[PDB]
Every structure is written in structure tokens, then in C-alpha cells.
Design a protein around this motif. Structure first.
Motif, PDB file in Angstrom:
ATOM      1  N   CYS B 327      34.475 -14.428  -1.239  1.00 46.95           N
ATOM      2  CA  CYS B 327      35.740 -15.154  -1.601  1.00 46.95           C
ATOM      3  C   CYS B 327      36.632 -14.948  -0.594  1.00 46.95           C
ATOM      4  N   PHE B 328      37.627 -15.953  -0.498  1.00 46.42           N
ATOM      5  CA  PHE B 328      38.359 -16.240   0.743  1.00 46.42           C
ATOM      6  C   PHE B 328      39.914 -15.396   0.604  1.00 46.42           C
ATOM      7  N   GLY B 329      40.379 -15.522  -0.369  1.00 43.81           N
ATOM      8  CA  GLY B 329      41.846 -15.083  -0.637  1.00 43.81           C
ATOM      9  C   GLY B 329      41.865 -13.628  -1.302  1.00 43.81           C
ATOM     10  N   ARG B 330      42.898 -13.080  -1.139  1.00 44.49           N
ATOM     11  CA  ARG B 330      43.114 -11.776  -1.891  1.00 44.49           C
ATOM     12  C   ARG B 330      44.092 -11.947  -2.957  1.00 44.49           C
ATOM     13  N   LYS B 331      43.879 -10.920  -4.039  1.00 43.64           N
ATOM     14  CA  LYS B 331      44.921 -10.812  -5.079  1.00 43.64           C
ATOM     15  C   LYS B 331      45.760  -9.839  -5.481  1.00 43.64           C
ATOM     16  N   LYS B 332      45.196  -8.433  -5.123  1.00 42.34           N
ATOM     17  CA  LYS B 332      46.026  -7.419  -5.436  1.00 42.34           C
ATOM     18  C   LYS B 332      46.829  -6.945  -4.093  1.00 42.34           C
ATOM     19  N   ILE B 333      47.879  -7.607  -4.023  1.00 41.80           N
ATOM     20  CA  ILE B 333      48.682  -7.765  -2.948  1.00 41.80           C
ATOM     21  C   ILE B 333      48.609  -9.043  -2.243  1.00 41.80           C
ATOM     22  N   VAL B 334      49.528  -9.767  -1.981  1.00 44.18           N
ATOM     23  CA  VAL B 334      49.506 -11.199  -1.521  1.00 44.18           C
ATOM     24  C   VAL B 334      48.834 -12.047  -2.710  1.00 44.18           C
ATOM     25  N   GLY B 335      49.372 -13.300  -2.805  1.00 39.45           N
ATOM     26  CA  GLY B 335      49.455 -14.056  -4.081  1.00 39.45           C
ATOM     27  C   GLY B 335      48.322 -15.336  -3.649  1.00 39.45           C
ATOM     28  N   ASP B 336      47.168 -15.045  -3.073  1.00 43.55           N
ATOM     29  CA  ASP B 336      46.485 -16.376  -2.557  1.00 43.55           C
ATOM     30  C   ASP B 336      45.993 -16.798  -3.715  1.00 43.55           C
ATOM     31  N   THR B 337      46.301 -18.262  -3.854  1.00 42.40           N
ATOM     32  CA  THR B 337      45.732 -19.177  -4.724  1.00 42.40           C
ATOM     33  C   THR B 337      44.678 -20.294  -4.109  1.00 42.40           C
ATOM     34  N   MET B 338      44.651 -21.204  -4.945  1.00 38.19           N
ATOM     35  CA  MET B 338      43.656 -22.497  -4.529  1.00 38.19           C
ATOM     36  C   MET B 338      44.372 -23.245  -3.053  1.00 38.19           C
ATOM     37  N   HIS B 339      45.636 -23.199  -3.083  1.00 37.24           N
ATOM     38  CA  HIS B 339      46.233 -23.773  -1.760  1.00 37.24           C
ATOM     39  C   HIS B 339      45.768 -22.970  -0.741  1.00 37.24           C
ATOM     40  N   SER B 348      50.842 -18.542  -1.325  1.00 34.18           N
ATOM     41  CA  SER B 348      51.259 -18.249  -2.545  1.00 34.18           C
ATOM     42  C   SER B 348      51.871 -19.385  -3.052  1.00 34.18           C
ATOM     43  N   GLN B 349      51.186 -20.508  -3.567  1.00 27.90           N
ATOM     44  CA  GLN B 349      51.801 -21.612  -4.093  1.00 27.90           C
ATOM     45  C   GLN B 349      50.775 -22.187  -4.788  1.00 27.90           C
ATOM     46  N   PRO B 350      51.358 -23.083  -5.867  1.00 28.09           N
ATOM     47  CA  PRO B 350      50.532 -23.460  -6.948  1.00 28.09           C
ATOM     48  C   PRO B 350      49.624 -24.937  -6.285  1.00 28.09           C
ATOM     49  N   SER B 351      48.970 -25.603  -7.134  1.00 27.79           N
ATOM     50  CA  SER B 351      48.171 -26.547  -6.458  1.00 27.79           C
ATOM     51  C   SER B 351      49.186 -27.807  -6.308  1.00 27.79           C
ATOM     52  N   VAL B 352      49.282 -28.340  -5.104  1.00 25.91           N
ATOM     53  CA  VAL B 352      50.147 -29.294  -5.002  1.00 25.91           C
ATOM     54  C   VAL B 352      49.375 -30.830  -5.151  1.00 25.91           C
TER      55      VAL B 352
END
Lengths: 816, 816
Positions: B327-339, B348-352
Motif C-alpha cells: 500500500c502506497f500512502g500512510r495514515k497514522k501521521i500524514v493523511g494520505d488519501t486516494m488523491h 491530504s485532499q479529498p477526491s477531486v
């Protein structure tokens, strides 16, 4: 019955103008914590002093009536203390005080000419106790009418110990809920304010949040975050309907979202309960061994018994389970338990604390470390030593030193079973472990004063009283509110021998819950209880009461656990004595039945639901040939025969179904809701007729508002039943079967295909060949032999299914 | 608090004989559809004329009392119009008319000497509103006694907007329920009478009946016709008991028979919701690619966030998930999402909107097209273009042209996600996709009048406001019945900064639901709610109200959403002012608690229930060392820390637990059922004592029947909390792990066996070798290396289980 003495009986019969006085020993609502300060109020008029304190007489205008039926019902009173007294109103409305607790004691002092006429046996000869409860009360009602007189009354409500009927006292399985973490000082969490300081230092539930996932790593897709329901088939109580009731019964609970599954059960007698996965990790440098700590029940079990490594127990049900898989001891006849596993000789004995070691069917080495609860017990040297060597995977993954497990990682009151797996290519997944647990140490008293609380986990009102006199999981009742003598009397009423069945036909004599065959063991109401401590105190206690049949009645100030009974010495209440009103109410259309159906958790079905039914030729012919079935489910009774007799008794009890309702004078004080009386209303045709009271309403005035139930001798005389031993239902059908036959013919092919029809490839293991052989079931013919090619070699044949279960290796030690 | 003006305050204090008059602006029951015609009745006697219409004064004998507590309670009135007026009875009993709607507004006009004394600040200085509700009314009661006087009264009933408390207003996911198909004219369904005409032409749920089966073709045997539950862990409200409540919580719903599962949820903030499969098909000429449209939530999502391809999310939880799978992004510190997935850089941004494309772990190409809701949105060129090419399997199987999908197939308010699979031999089944969805376009108002709507789904009473002012799924409330200033004041009350925890220690800062670390984000009650629109409007709204703490209250005609508060400017009600009655009721027995327990769907547990518990040393010592635990479950709160503070507050609120009940004169009009007053009865010792009212009963006469609740400052002062960041529980245990190590040593043997003991055969795929190799786990040794035989070749290692999952391919590009 309250004895009252012959002296007080004579006074009540003759004097005919008696001056009642109430002695209210209130406990003041106190804030900030201190010694109890009691205000002693009395109704009367002068100042009636009874053994010391004055009992001031300037308040308490009236006292409510103490109504309590044959159902635990939060029996409640209500004072009326005048609201014009500044002291009481100030004590009521002051800011900061909290009075969840605080005992109220009321004595109905029958004033003599000069100072109380001494009723009550073996309590110093003073007034009858009247309430003896806790204070959960309201407050002022002011009226201050502008026209004239206004009223102002302080109404202290006060109720039985079972107030807050949704109280859920149970220890859970979280560190914070086990040692009571607080947030005192700046940012650290000391351990304050939990049940006994031993728990405050009991640092043993710290790794319980993350254990479930660690097991879900090594587990089947279906049984992920999934335990069985810790209590199956709860008691039907007419609140349910059969379809809805049996729908509510669920075999498995979803641990992920249902936190109520984490509550530690209380088990009395012998019963199967699932295990909560408290702890889980794998050894370093060899990460196939898995160490799992499973919490099962609560303090000081008699012993663990026949662990479940799946749906296949260690000790075979019958020669049928003996044939299917490899089990060491038998179960139907002889009571082989895990101690048979430990010693190797057929024994009938619970687990003797920390040594009930390896269970080894050909698959993996299952070392199970069984621990009971104790007032002072220490963590196993296994976990502590391995943590000292720092040989746990998640330790060095997180970086934990010798504090992941330590001597202070005790588990003081619980039934935890450290279980070690060896997950080879032969046992693909860690199964879902449950176990059969034998009881909780019920303090069994004896008319003699010698308390036996040693191993027993008996069956009777002893169980209910132990659940009542326990701080940890019950409701604080202090054990001084009980009168021991009548408690022992009613317990002896429960264990009157049932000359209906015989011990010869009980196959599973042991797992019903009696030890040692020969002894009598034929007792009415031999209930085996699970008390999941997540439901409520109120509901669990009423469940036990519905189980053995009875009610808790704090009428005379003591709880006085009575049971249904027949006796030749009742009270002879004539109608002329009582009063004028006399209600008769035959609820006969709905509440009497001709056949009953029951539901057991039968050990003769591998703890699966079993149904008992009768029919009656006398009853149905009496009716008019109308089919009408009583329906029942016994949550607490696991013996088929005692449940059968209990169902018959409750059927006949329904068949009687008559209620009287009248009021008797103060002559008959002391009556409690399971005391026998004989009514003799002459017009009815009634000469002595056995009734058991169902309501008693002690009134401030003196009159008693009784309510009766009609109970003839036939309900208690009990019947004769037929043996049910051949109709055993072992759970043979949860394992893949091994090869039927095996021999070496100079092929090693003699293995007949497994009866379990979904097998894909058998496995052959040689002595020196590192690579196991594979033969595959491309065609499945139940009578046919498939061939392997190939001295002093050892051989193993494990059938493999479409899931990888693997079947008890049939081994040949042959010379090539 | 209604401001009431100083002029009206002075008049009410002085005049002491005031002539009240009610201005009833009825709306006539009208049939066949037309403009609203209002009959203007008034009680008074002359003809009281307010702002235009004359308000006839010949009917309405009496008006009922308007009672509403801190529980949304269908607040109801009842007119009494004389039944001897022909007009009113005729309008009552005319056959053909319906009055489901029809506003009723009552003004309690305080008549001056000559014509209304001008109160109500902001409203034209006129009379206070009294009801402002809708009419759901009864009818005649005639008596015509033969003896004499007979009565006849029209009892017009009228209630709050939440009448018909079991309305299920929701959109569901079928063509007819989406565009209101009717059966007019001969044989065709038009699209008439639906929520807004854009749905009437929104021809986009046409293929929704048959989609579930089409997926069930490409799906596991277990998760067949099986969605998860759209709302898990709903709010405990004392209507349930812990065992029953936690049993009702179900993780999966059976879509086959449960049609309530198809209703479209409404999500505020970020929360995990399953995706309803409203479409499914496969391409022609290559029938492995699967196109699935998944409907998630309602209009204008902030953005889709971390889709789930199973129980393994695209964005790994911790280094633990990072190690297991790819899996590519992190979650526990930094807010990597599908963007982050789309761009390739940590964001750290919602889907555009429509571009959040391929997710590629070695298995198959998961192409996900994410769409929000929007008042004007069009179907993707993907489905429309492929339908134009007519390259869908079921199209030419049935014979459907370029109308299977078309530009008409919009989804005009839905959070749908066109998901494309590539079902190879490497991803055997289509998994059950759920996702995490960020909120709704909530109109967030500001004291200034600048409406900020589109931007974020906030956490407060704005969520309830959006749910109330929404035609599509809420209850039509027109947004003109709310007073904006008081609503903004209450919202500012909710988001008072909680100086208890710190943002430094909230790991998943983003997945709680606040964007951009550094900013404050420490707000009391950050509820992140799910509103499945299949339960009811009544129960959902009371769910939010129980969540944040408050009530909806139309006493002054405006809904006026109040919350609990502490303020130094209360009302100073002395007992001398009240009247005569003053009730007091301490429910200390059942409603006073020492220890709290809560239940959260934390994002720090992969959306799995977690338990917060307190013990308190002051409180348990205050009682008597009595253990009585408050039990809670927060359905809407996902912060561990804010839910911790909320549990502490509600525990202390339970600790206070005092109720007053008295009446006040008309001087105190405007009191609102969650307003602060200070009661000062002298005898009690009560100098200023902070109470929040619990009931207000405006009466036609003028008196107000208040009921109080005791909330000291201690509940609002709040406390400190401990750091909880290391105790995270990621869901590592839902995927098979790959080989531990791998290198090529001059064959490829180095792969250490997977920690998952569910392993059967590894797969090796070369660059040119079409047929992959098979290495089988005949013996499982966690520390051992097994061999393959065998430059510039690419290698892949996928461990295979007894189910066919396959791991994350470990790859080396080595030179042979």
C-alpha cells in the motif's frame, strides 16, 4: 415464617389494642466520605428507645406499605418526613451530598405498657424488622396555597438492594476496567478505585485490545473476531414467543462490534463456555508456536475439564467419536477429563491448577496451561520466563523489554488457560477454543456452623446466594442480611431425593455435574448455571429464581430465599379471621396446560438443544380432548431426568391455577410469599385446602394483604419416568474421517477412501523422506483401493479436505 | 430565551391586568390544488387586527397548552372551534379534501389599551409566535342531549413538523423510487411527482434490480447478496440493555431480503460506509473487466477518501500494514488519501471528482472512477462511450442499443463510484467494496450573513440543520422557521476549544475528520454521523440530538436548536415569584453513576468498536465504595479524546441529577426548554443555584409550567485526559502475507514461508515463460528455504491460500 415467639403470639391474640411504633434508623446522606452518621427517627409519640439510641419522635408522619410478590421486584417504601423541619430539608437539598448507598432500617416496635414486648427469636428480643433496605429517594413537595393551609412532605423513597435494575456489574476484559485507571495528577494514570486493590496492581489485562487481531491472523476466514455466545438458550419467561425466543438464541457472537461478549462469565457446576482471547503472540526464532491466554470464568474454578480444540473435544463422545478421530479417554460411562490426559490413567478429576499439559493428536502439539482463579495466584513461569528471554515476536516488533509479561501480570480472579499451539502444515489454522468449566466455589453452609466452600460448585440456592454475596460480580449484600438457618432449610428442601430415575442410566454422570457415581446425586433441581455478567444483576437473579423456582423476599428485613414446598404444618386461616373481602380469580383459560415441551443444553448432545415432551391421558380427558401444550426452555438445568421431572411439576402447577386475595389482621404477622396456609371458607366446601401465598403487603396500620396460589400435593409428589440413555447424540460430524483400513502388502495402498466425501489428496509421511507423498482422489469410490509406489519406517496417513482439515493419522510401523 | 423587549418587560411587570388575545392564522384544507387560502380566526372579542388581515373573532372557544421537553416530541396543540358554525364544520367534513400539510401560526397578542403593545425584537414589533406548526387534526364531537344543553366542538389538532413519527423519507435505489414512475394513460410509466424534476429525468437507476445477481456471479460464496450495515453501533438510549443492544448491532446485512439496505445514507464528516451495487456488467470480447457502480451517500460529498478493495484498504495503517501488503500512502501521521494514489505525491485532499484512477497492487488493475453528488452532474464518458460502442456483455445478450447507458443516465444526487476490476488468475473474486466518505455540503452560517456551504462537512448542529432543511431526505422545514442568530450562537457554543488533549497526539488527524493539522481542531463534540435514511426522520433526528446533546423546540414558533451550556447571565427566579407548587425528585438510585464506559467506531481500529472507561476516586468514595458504572455508546463521535471528554461530562451530569417542577407567571414568557435559571428558595439554603429547565408548558391563560434539571459548573468545566496514541489496533489480520525474504543466489529459493499458515502453493512468473511455476507447501517450516530450478527477467512471488487470495507480489529484476 417468622417465629414471633409464643409470648408475642399470645399478646397479639389477647391484648386487642396494641400501640405500634416504627423505629427508623436512617443513615444520613454524607458527602466527601466519612464514618456513617445515623439519624434515629420514630413515628410513635414519646421517644421510644430500643437498645441504646433515643429514636427521636418529632418527624415521620407516615410510612408506605411493603408490597412484594413471588417475583424479585425492587421492593420499595416511602417515608413522609415533615417538610417544616429545617434539619431534614437542609440535609436533603444540600449541594454535594450523594446517597446512592446508605442503609435504612425500620423496626415495627409493638409498644407494651412500658417499652416493647420482645418478639423475634435469635435476634435480641426486640421489634420485628420491617424494611432493612437502601435509600434511593426523592424530595420535597411544597404547596404554600394563598388560600390557607399548604402541605410540605419529604418523601424519602427507599428500595431493595436491587435498585437500578439495569446495573451490569461485571469485570470486563480490559486493563482499564480491570484495575480502574484514573486520570489523576497531570497526565499519568495511577490505579485507584477498583474492586479490591489486588486488582489495582493486577497488571494482567494490558494486552487484550490487540490480541483478537493477532488471533485473526492465524484463523479461518469465517471465525474471524467471532466467539460463541457465552450463554445459550436463556430461560423462557412468557415475555417471548417460541419463534421469536428461538430466533434470539444465537450460537456465535461477533466480537468485533459486540463488546458485551468480553464480559467474564460466572459458571456454577459443569457447563461449556467459550474462551475470550485475552492474549496472543508467537515465539521468536520459531514463529509457528502461538501462545494464547483464554479467560473463561471467574474466581477459583473447581477445575477445567475437556478443552475444545474445535468442535471435536479431546475426550471422545462414545465409541463413535473414538472411531472417527484419535481421542484418549471415553465420556459415556467413566468420566475421563483432562486429568486423564495429564496422567495417562483413566481418571475423573478436574484440572489440578497449573499442570494439565500437552494434548497430542497427530497434527500439532497442543500444550494447554490451565489456571483457575484464586485470592492469591501468580502468572505462569512460562510467559514470564519467555518474556524475560524476550522471545515474543510482537515484543521486539514494538520494542518491549521484560514487561510484556511479568510477575505482576497476574490474573487474580478468572479462569484463564494459556494455550500453546504448534501450527504445522498439518493444522492449518488455530481453531475456536471453548471448554467445559466446573463451577464456582459456592460457600455451602451447614446446620452446625461449619462452612464448606471448598471444591463443590454445588447446585441450589447456594448458587444464587453466592452470586448475591460477591463483591466482584454480584451485588453487595454483606452476607449479614441473610438468616442462615432458613437459607439452609430451603437448600435442604431443594435437594430432596427424586426417586424417579436411577443413576445407572445417566451415561454422562460426570458432565451433568455430580462427581463420583455411587453416591446419591439424584436431587430435584440440579441446575448448572451460566451467568454472563453483561446482562444485568436484576435479570440474572430473576433468571436463577425462575430456574429453581422461588423468590427473594426482604419482608422481615432479611432476604430469606424461599422455594416452593409442601408441608404438613401450614397456617390454618379461617375466613372469619381475615376480613371481609375475598377475591377469587381463575386464570384457567390461558395458564393451565395438558402437555409440556422443554429445551435443554444436554451434555448427551455435545451441549446442543434437546427437547422433552409428555402427554397426559388424565389431563386431556379432563379437559375435553383439547390439545394445549405448555412450552418451556430450561437455561440452567442440563440433566435430562431432573429437567423432565421439573417440567412435569411445572405442568401440574399450571393445572391447578387458582388465586385468592384477601386481608388478614396483625395476628398473622411474619408471613412470607412462600409460606403454606390452609383456607377453610365453609360455604365453598373448602375444608383445609393447601395454598401458597404469592403476595404479602405489610401495612403501617397492621393489616396484611395476602394473595394466594392453589398448590395441591400432586405437584410435589412427583412422577415416575423412563430412562433415556440409548438416545445419545454425539457430535461426530465435525471432522474429516481417516482411512478406513490400512495394511502393507508386499503399495501401502490398503487405505480405503475416507467416509468424509470431500477429500482431495491424502498425505503419506515417511521416516527419512523429507518430502511427503501425495495421492489424490480424482475418483471417489467408497469401496476401492488406491496405490502408493515406495525397512523400519514409520508411516502416517492424513486425509485432506477442500479446507485442509487433516484426519487423525493412522500409523503403521512396518518393516519394508 | 426570546428577547421580549424592555417595553414588554416593563408592561408585564407593571400593568398586572393584561388582555391576552390569540391570532390564529389557519390555512384552509383545500383540495384539487390551488393557492393557499387562510381563515384568520382569533379568540379575543372585538376583531384584533395585526398587520393587514382583520382576524375575525367569532370562533375558537379555547386553545390547548404547548408542552415540549428536552426530547423532540411531536409538540401538539388542539383548537376548539364551535361546532355550531356552519362554515367550519362544512370545511371539516367535506369529502375530497386533504390537509396533510397546511401551516398554523398562532400569535398571543398582548392587547394594549388600543391595539397590541409591540413586543418581539426583530419580528415586526408584534406579538410572540405561539405554535407555528402543521395541522393534523381531528373533528366534531356532537352530543345533542335529549334532556337539554348539548355541546359541539371542532377539535382541530395540530402538531410539530415531525408528525407521523414513522415517516421513512429517503431515496432508495430503484428506478421508480428515483423518478416517481406513474401509471397514467394507457400503458407507459411517465416520470411525475418526484422530488424535483431533475430526478424525473434522472433515468439512472434503471439497471439496479439485476445488478446484485451480476456481482454474485463474480463473488465469494459467503459475501453473496451481502452488504455491510450502513450504520453500525447506533446510540444507546436506555431503551436497550447492553446484551440486547450489542446483539442488535450487526456487521453485515442480507441484501436479498432486506430492502432497507438499498436506501442511500447521508454522511457528515468522514466515516466508513458500504457501497450499494446499483450496476454491474462486463465488457464484450474481454469478459474479465467488471464495471460496477457503487452508490454511497448523497449530494456534494467533500470527496471520496481511501476506498476499500476488501478488508484491506488502499492506504496502509502503520508500518504494520505497510509490511504485510503493498500500500502506497500512510495514515497514522500524514493523511494520505486516494488523491495521493492519483498524483503520486503525499497529499491530504479529498477526491477531486471524476479522476482518482488506477489502484495497482500486484493482482489486477483496480480502476475506480469517483463521483460526488452535484445539482448538475453528468454520467462519465466511460459508461456512455462503452455503451455507444455497445461493448457491454448483457447489452448484446439482451439486445440493448445505446440506451443501456446514456448521457441521460446521470445520478443527479448520489456519491457513486464507477469501479473497474481486472479479474485475472491473481484476484479470483470481486471483493465487497466499502469506502470512507467525507461529509455533506452543510450550509454553515456566520454572524455576518455570509453563508459558507460548499467546503466542508462540519461537526455540530450544522449537521442537524442540513438534515432538517433538506427536501430530498430530511423533513421540509423551509429554513425560514429557524432563527439564524440563535442557531449560530448555539453552534459557537458547541465548538468551544477543549483544552484537554492536544492535536500532537491524534494519529489519524485526517481520518477523524479535521483537515490540516496545525489549525485548532480541538472542539467539543466533533460528531461524525451516519444517517441511514431507512430508519425514520423522527429517530434519526433524535439520534443527532442525543449525540451532541440538545433538543429541538418550537415554543416561540421557531425551532431554535438549543444545546447544554453554562453562562453567568441566567434568570433569577425566586420562589416568591413562582406560585405554590414546588416538586423535588432525586432519582439518585437509578440515574447517578460513578464510572463510565463508552463505545466508539475509531479510525484507529479500522472502524472497529473501542471501549473508553473511567473510574473516579471522589465519586466512589462519596457513595460508599459502591461500583455502579454508567454505560454509553457513541454512534456519531469518532475522536477518542472528544468522546472521552463527552463521557466525562455526561457522567458528571448523571452525578448531579435533581429535578424541580413549578409554575411561573406570564412575566417570564419566552423561557425555552434548555435555558439557564438560578432558583433561590430561601428555606432550602438555596442562594443562586444553576438549573437548566427541562420542560416549558406555555398555557393559554398565561402561566408557564416549568420543570428543572440540576447542572452545576462541574459538568461543563471538563477535565484532562491521558495520551492514547500507541494503543492503536490496525487490521493487519485480513490479508495473506508474502514471502518474508527473497533473493537470487547463483534457484530463487530464498523465499521464507509466509507467516500466514493458510498457504498452499506459491506462484513464480517469469518474463517469457507463459506457464507460471508452482511450489507447494508440503511441509511448513517458518525458518526454512524451498527451491525453484530455473538474464534480464522479472520475477513475482504470490503466496496462495486454501481460498486463492494471493499476496502482494515480491519482485526482483535480476540478471540470470
Amino acid at each position: 415464617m417468622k417465629k414471633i415467639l409464643d409470648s408475642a403470639k399470645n399478646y397479639l391474640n389477647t391484648h386487642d389494642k396494641l400501640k405500634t411504633a416504627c423505629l427508623i434508623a436512617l443513615e444520613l446522606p454524607s458527602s466527601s466520605g466519612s464514618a456513617a452518621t445515623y439519624i434515629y427517627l420514630t413515628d410513635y409519640f414519646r421517644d421510644v428507645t430500643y437498645n441504646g439510641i433515643l429514636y427521636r419522635s418529632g418527624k415521620v408522619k407516615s410510612i408506605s406499605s411493603h408490597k412484594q410478590n413471588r417475583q424479585l421486584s425492587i421492593g420499595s417504601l416511602s417515608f413522609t418526613i415533615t417538610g417544616t423541619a429545617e434539619d431534614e430539608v437542609l440535609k436533603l437539598v444540600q449541594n454535594g451530598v450523594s446517597f446512592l448507598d446508605r442503609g435504612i432500617t425500620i423496626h415495627q416496635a409493638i409498644i407494651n405498657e412500658e417499652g416493647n414486648i420482645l418478639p423475634v427469636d435469635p435476634d435480641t428480643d426486640g421489634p420485628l424488622l420491617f424494611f432493612r433496605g437502601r435509600i434511593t429517594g426523592g424530595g420535597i413537595k411544597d404547596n404554600v396555597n394563598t388560600s390557607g393551609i399548604g402541605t410540605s412532605v419529604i418523601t424519602w423513597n427507599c428500595s431493595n438492594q436491587f435498585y437500578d435494575f439495569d446495573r451490569v456489574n461485571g469485570r470486563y476484559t480490559d486493563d482499564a476496567s480491570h484495575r480502574g485507571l484514573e486520570v489523576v495528577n497531570g497526565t499519568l494514570q495511577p490505579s485507584n478505585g477498583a474492586k479490591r486493590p489486588e486488582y489495582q496492581e493486577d497488571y494482567g489485562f494490558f494486552h487484550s485490545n490487540k490480541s483478537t487481531t493477532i488471533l485473526a491472523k492465524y484463523q479461518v476466514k469465517e471465525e474471524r473476531y467471532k466467539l460463541q455466545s457465552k450463554k445459550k438458550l436463556f430461560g423462557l419467561s412468557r415475555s417471548y414467543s417460541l419463534k421469536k425466543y428461538y430466533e434470539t438464541v444465537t450460537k456465535e457472537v461477533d466480537l468485533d462490534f459486540n463488546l458485551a461478549a468480553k464480559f467474564i462469565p460466572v459458571v456454577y457446576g459443569v457447563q461449556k463456555i467459550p474462551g475470550i482471547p485475552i492474549f496472543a503472540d508467537t515465539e521468536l526464532n520459531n514463529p509457528n508456536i502461538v501462545y494464547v491466554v483464554y479467560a473463561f470464568a471467574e474466581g477459583e474454578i473447581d477445575g477445567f475439564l475437556d478443552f475444545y480444540i474445535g468442535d471435536s473435544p479431546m475426550i471422545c463422545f462414545d465409541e463413535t467419536d473414538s472411531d472417527t478421530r484419535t481421542c484418549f479417554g471415553r465420556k459415556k460411562i467413566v468420566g475421563d477429563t483432562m486429568h486423564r490426559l495429564a496422567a495417562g490413567t483413566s481418571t475423573s478429576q478436574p484440572s489440578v491448577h497449573g499442570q494439565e499439559y500437552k494434548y497430542n493428536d497427530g497434527n500439532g502439539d497442543i500444550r494447554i496451561w490451565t489456571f483457575h482463579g484464586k485470592p492469591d495466584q501468580t502468572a505462569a513461569q512460562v510467559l514470564v520466563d519467555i518474556a524475560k528471554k524476550k522471545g515474543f515476536y510482537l515484543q521486539n516488533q514494538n520494542g518491549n523489554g521484560p514487561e510484556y509479561w511479568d510477575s505482576r501480570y497476574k490474573l487474580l480472579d478468572t479462569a484463564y488457560a494459556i494455550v500453546r499451539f504448534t501450527i504445522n502444515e498439518n493444522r492449518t489454522e488455530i481453531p475456536e477454543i471453548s471448554a467445559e468449566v466446573q463451577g464456582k466455589k459456592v460457600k455451602v453452609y451447614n446446620s452446625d456452623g461449619t462452612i464448606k466452600a471448598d471444591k463443590t460448585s454445588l447446585n441450589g440456592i447456594w448458587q444464587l446466594m453466592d452470586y448475591l454475596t460477591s463483591d466482584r460480580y454480584g451485588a453487595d449484600i454483606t452476607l449479614d442480611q441473610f438468616p442462615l438457618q432458613k437459607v439452609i432449610s430451603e437448600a435442604k428442601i431443594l435437594d430432596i431425593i427424586d426417586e424417579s430415575y436411577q443413576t445407572s442410566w445417566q451415561p454422562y454422570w460426570r458432565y451433568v455435574g455430580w462427581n463420583d457415581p455411587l453416591s446419591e446425586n439424584r436431587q430435584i433441581v440440579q441446575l448448572n448455571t451460566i451467568l454472563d455478567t453483561s446482562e444485568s444483576v436484576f435479570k440474572n437473579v430473576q433468571g436463577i429464581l425462575e430456574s429453581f423456582g422461588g423468590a427473594i423476599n426482604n419482608l422481615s428485613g432479611e432476604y430469606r430465599i424461599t422455594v416452593e414446598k409442601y408441608s404438613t404444618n401450614p397456617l390454618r386461616i379461617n375466613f372469619l379471621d381475615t376480613y371481609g373481602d375475598l377475591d377469587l380469580s381463575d386464570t384457567t383459560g390461558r395458564n393451565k396446560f395438558n402437555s409440556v415441551q422443554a429445551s435443554l443444553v444436554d451434555p448427551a448432545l455435545s451441549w446442543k438443544t434437546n427437547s422433552i415432551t409428555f402427554y397426559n391421558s388424565k389431563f386431556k380427558e379432563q379437559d375435553k380432548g383439547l390439545d394445549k401444550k405448555l412450552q418451556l426452555s430450561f437455561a440452567n438445568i442440563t440433566n435430562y431426568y431432573t429437567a423432565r421431572s421439573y417440567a412435569d411439576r411445572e405442568l401440574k402447577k399450571s393445572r391447578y391455577s387458582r388465586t385468592l386475595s384477601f386481608s388478614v389482621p396483625y395476628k398473622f404477622i411474619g408471613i412470607e410469599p412462600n409460606d403454606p396456609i390452609a383456607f377453610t371458607y365453609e360455604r365453598y366446601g373448602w375444608k383445609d385446602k393447601f395454598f401458597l401465598v404469592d403476595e404479602v403487603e405489610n401495612t403501617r396500620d397492621g393489616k396484611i394483604n395476602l394473595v394466594l396460589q392453589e398448590y395441591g400435593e400432586d405437584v410435589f409428589i412427583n412422577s415416575e419416568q423412563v430412562d433415556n440413555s440409548g438416545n445419545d447424540i454425539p457430535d461426530i460430524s465435525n471432522n474429516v474421517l481417516p482411512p478406513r483400513d490400512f495394511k502393507y502388502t508386499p503399495g501401502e495402498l490398503s487405505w480405503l477412501p475416507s467416509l468424509t466425501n470431500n477429500v482431495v489428496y491424502y498425505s503419506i509421511a515417511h521416516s527419512g523422506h523429507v518430502n511427503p507423498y501425495i495421492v489424490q482422489q480424482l475418483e471417489n469410490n467408497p469401496n476401492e483401493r488406491m496405490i502408493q509406489e515406495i525397512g523400519l519406517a514409520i508411516f502416517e496417513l492424513r486425509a485432506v479436505d477442500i479446507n485442509g482439515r487433516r484426519s487423525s493419522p493412522v500409523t503403521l510401523s512396518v518393516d519394508l
